[PDB]
Amino acid sequence: QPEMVEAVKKHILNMLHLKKRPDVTQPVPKAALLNAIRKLHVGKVGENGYVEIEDDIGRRAEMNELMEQTSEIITFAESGTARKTLHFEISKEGSDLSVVERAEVWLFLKVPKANRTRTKVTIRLFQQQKHERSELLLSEKVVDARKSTWHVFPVSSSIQRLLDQGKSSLDVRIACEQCQESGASLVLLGEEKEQSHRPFLMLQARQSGLECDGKVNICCKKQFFVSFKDIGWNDWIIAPSGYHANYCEGECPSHIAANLKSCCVPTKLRPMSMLYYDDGQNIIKKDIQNMIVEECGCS
Amino acid sequence: QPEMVEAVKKHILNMLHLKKRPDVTQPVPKAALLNAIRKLHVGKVGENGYVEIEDDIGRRAEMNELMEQTSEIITFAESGTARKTLHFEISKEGSDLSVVERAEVWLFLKVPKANRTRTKVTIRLFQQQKHERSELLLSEKVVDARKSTWHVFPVSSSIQRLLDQGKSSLDVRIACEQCQESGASLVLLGEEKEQSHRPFLMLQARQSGLECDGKVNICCKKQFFVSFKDIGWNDWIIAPSGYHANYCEGECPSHIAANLKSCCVPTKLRPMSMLYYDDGQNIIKKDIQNMIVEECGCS
Ligand SMILES: [Cl-]
Ligand SMILES: [Cl-]
C-alpha cells in the first residue's frame, strides 16, 4: 500500500513534468489565493474555503461521453393511407435508446398570399392507434398564419410512450380547419418545388468493460481513490480533493486461435484538471489528458 | 488494399452497431434533407450541397487537446527592493510554454472614502530592466477612482518578449501621481486585512509518438485516409467526406530487463461524429468515441 501510493505519486509528478513535489513553505495567504482564483475564474470557492475548478476539462469529458451516448434521428414522413395522414417509420436506433431527451414534429405552413385576418390557427396532431381505432392527441398548438414558415410541435413524452410500448411506427392525422380561412395550407407531402418543405419528426434520445471484483485473472479495472489529504499532498494541491487512480490488471488471451499478443490496456481514458502550487508564489491550473482510466480491455 | 478497405468498412459498421451498410434506395430528396439538417442545426450546408456537421464532437476534442496544451499561471508579487516596486518570479512552467496567449497584471485600487472629483487616474507599470538601468513601459492605463476595485493591465506582448528572452524574472515599478488626489492608494503588498488584495500576474500560455515512415518494426501509427466517395459509401454517409483510418503497427519490447508483455496500442484517441442514412427515411447524427487514432505507443 505505501508502494502503491508512491507509484501514484510518481505518476502524478510525471504527468505534471515535475521531478518531485514542491518543497514545503509558507505559501501565499489563503485570502489572496482565493480572491485571485475567484477573479480569474480559475476556481470557484464556497465558504469555509472549499475549492473547485471552474473550467474543469473532466466535466467537458463527461459531457462528451453524454454526446457519445446520445443519438439524433430525423424521420421523414411517408404518405398515409388516409387523407391528411403521415406515416413515420422510426429507425431501430430509437429502439436501442431508452431515454427520450426530446422529440419534435416539424410541419411547414405555406401561406401563398399574406393574410392578417384570422392571424392564428389551431393545428392538431392525432396519433392513430388501433385497439378498433382510437386517436391520441399528439399535439395541440396555436400558430401564427401571417407568413409561410416552419412550425415545431413538441412530442417528447408521446414518443417516449411510443418507444416504451416497443413500437417505432407512428401514423399522424393532422387537423387545421382554420387554415384555409387564413389562406394557409400544411405541406404534408414535400412534392416537387415544395419538396424542401417535407415534414419530419426529430428525435434526440439517450441510452440508459470489466471491473476487478472477485474476477481471478481476467482483464479489469481496479478502482483506487486516493485523497491528497491522506497522503500529505493537500498543501500544494489546491484542487481537487482526491484522485481516482484506477488501473488495468489481468492477462489477455492471444490471437493464436497483425499482432498475436494481447495486453490488458486502458480503452477509455478521461482527462483531469489540477490546481496546484508550483512553489510558494506560483499557482498553476493545468489540464492533463489520459489521467483517469475509465475502462480496461484486451488489445 | 481491398482487404484494408473491407477492414475499415467492418470497423465503421461495428462502431455504428450495424450488421451491414444500408441497402441502396431512392432516398429522401436532397432539398428536404438539407432543409431539415439546416433547421435542426444538425448540419451546416454551403451552396452546391456540401455538408458539414454543425455540432462536431471531434472539434470539441481538438478544443480539449488545446486546453491540454495550455497552462494558466498565477504569480503573486514579491516586495521589491525599491519603493513602489513588485517582484514577480514566474514559474519554470512558463519557460516550457512557447506561445503567450494572454497575460494580465491585477492591481487593487483602494479608495477608503469615495471621491468623484478627479474621477480618473493614470496608472503606469514600468518593467525595470538592466543593461545600466532602463525602464520599459509595461502598461499605461487610465482607470476610474470612484470606488475600491480591481484593475486589469494587459501585458501579453511584453511577457511574450520576456519569455522569448529566456527570462522569468520581472521587476515592476508602479506610478500613480494622481492617486492620492482621488484619495486612492494601490495595494502593492497584500498585508494583514488587505492580504486578499495582494497584486498578481496571470499568464495563460500554450506549448508550440512515432508515425510509420520508414521505421522497420518499432511501434508507430500508419495513416490511411479513406474517402467515402472512393469506396462507394458516399450515398448513405452524408458527412464527413472521408475517414482518417490511422492504426497501430509494430512490436514492443517487453518489461523483462505487473505485466511483462507490451503491445503497440493506441495511446491517444479522438471521437468522430457521423451523419448518415440508416435507411431511405431515417437520417442519424451520431457521436462515436475512440474512432480516430491520433497516437500509438507501447503499453
Ligand atoms: Cl512526498
Ligand atoms: Cl459495401
Residue numbers in the entry:
A (entry chain A), B (entry chain A): 51 to 181, 200 to 258, 283 to 300, 311 to 359, 385 to 426
Text of the article:
Activins, members of transforming growth factor β (TGF-β) superfamily, were first isolated from porcine ovarian follicular fluid and identified as activating factors for the release of follicle stimulating hormone. Activins function both in autocrine and paracrine manner. They conduce signalling by binding to extracellular domains of type I and type II receptors and allowing the kinase domains of type II receptors to phosphorylate those of type I receptors and initiate the intracellular signalling. Activins, like all other members in the TGF-β superfamily, are synthesized as larger precursors. During the secretory pathway, the precursors are processed by furin-like proteases that cleave the polypeptide after a dibasic recognition sequence between the pro- and mature domains, releasing the mature signalling domain from the covalent linkage to the pro-domain12.
We have engineered the protein to enable proteolytic activation in vitro, by replacing the original furin cleavage site with a HRV 3C protease site and removed two N-terminal cysteine residues, which by analogy to pro-TGF-β1 are likely to interact with the ECM, to avoid interference with native disulfide structure of the rest of the protein. To improve the quality of the crystals, we removed residues 259–282 (reported to be part of heparan sulfate-binding site19) from the pro-domain. The resulting protein yielded significantly better diffracting crystals, enabling us to determine its structure using multi-wavelength anomalous dispersion phasing with selenomethionine-labelled protein. We solved the structure of pro-activin A precursor at 3 Å and refinement of this structure against higher resolution native data yielded a final structure at 2.3 Å. The structure of the pro-activin A precursor consists of two subunit chains that are disulfide-linked at the mature domains. In each subunit, the N terminus of the pro-domain, starting from the first visible residue Q51, forms a helical ‘forearm' region consisting of three α-helices (α1, α2 and α3), a latency lasso and a β-hairpin. In the structure of pro-activin A, two precursor chains form a cross-armed, domain-swapped dimer. Although the electron density for the linker between the pro-domain and the mature domain (Glu301-Arg310) is not visible, it has been confirmed to be intact by SDS–PAGE analysis of dissolved crystals. Size-exclusion chromatography in combination with multiple-angle light scattering (SEC-MALS) analysis shows that pro-activin A is a single species with the expected molecular weight (91.5 kDa, calculated molecular weight 90.9 kDa). This uncleaved pro-activin A precursor is unable to induce the expression of an activin-inducible luciferase reporter gene in HEK293T cells, in agreement with previous findings that cleavage is required for bioactivity.
